């Protein structure tokens, strides 16, 4: 059975006006800004951007990839597909 989300989990993450996007739950570095309560720091593959999202907008990657893991015209999306499949745990700093 599922646990709560944890750093390193792979997802597609949804935000308004954007397709379901390949992403991971990030750690918070010592000294870094902490997320709001009940939100997680989401790192978006390809764009390398970060947003704070709650579980309603996080779809586990294994279950969802068949629906959401197809090429998209949006900037960064296809690079992000490569990252989540091929090196989802690397430093992209």
């Amino acid at each position: 059975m599922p646990h709560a989300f944890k750093p390193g989990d792979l997802v597609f993450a949804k935000m308004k006006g954007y397709p379901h996007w390949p992403a991971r739950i990030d750690d918070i570095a010592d000294g870094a800004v902490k997320p709001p309560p009940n939100k997680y720091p989401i790192f978006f593959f390809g764009t390398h951007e970060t947003a704070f999202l709650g579980p309603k907008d996080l779809f586990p990657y294994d279950k969802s990839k068949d629906k959401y893991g197809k090429p998209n015209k949006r900037k960064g999306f296809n690079e992000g597909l490569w990252e989540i499949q091929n090196n989802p745990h690397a430093s992209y700093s």
Side-chain angles (χ1 to χ4, degrees), residues 1-15 17-61 63-69 71-72 74 76-93:
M1 284 293 161
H3 298 109
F5 284 109
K6 65 178 187 291
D9 284 345
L10 304 183
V11 299
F12 289 85
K14 187 63 162 86
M15 271 160 87
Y18 285 92
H20 294 82
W21 200 282
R24 64 183 187 207
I25 314 288
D26 256 5
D27 285 284
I28 303 141
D30 288 342
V33 178
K34 291 183 283 172
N38 301 294
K39 306 301 171 68
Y40 289 86
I42 303 304
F43 176 81
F44 287 95
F45 295 116
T47 69
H48 311 139
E49 293 170 8
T50 291
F52 293 126
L53 285 180
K56 71 175 180 72
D57 289 319
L58 304 174
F59 289 80
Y61 173 75
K63 179 173 205 293
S64 295
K65 53 183 191 303
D66 277 3
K67 185 177 192 182
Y68 292 138
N72 202 258
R74 303 282 272 288
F77 192 102
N78 297 335
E79 185 170 5
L81 294 175
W82 178 97
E83 289 181 354
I84 195 164
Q85 184 167 28
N86 296 295
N87 206 335
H89 301 302
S91 166
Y92 285 99
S93 274

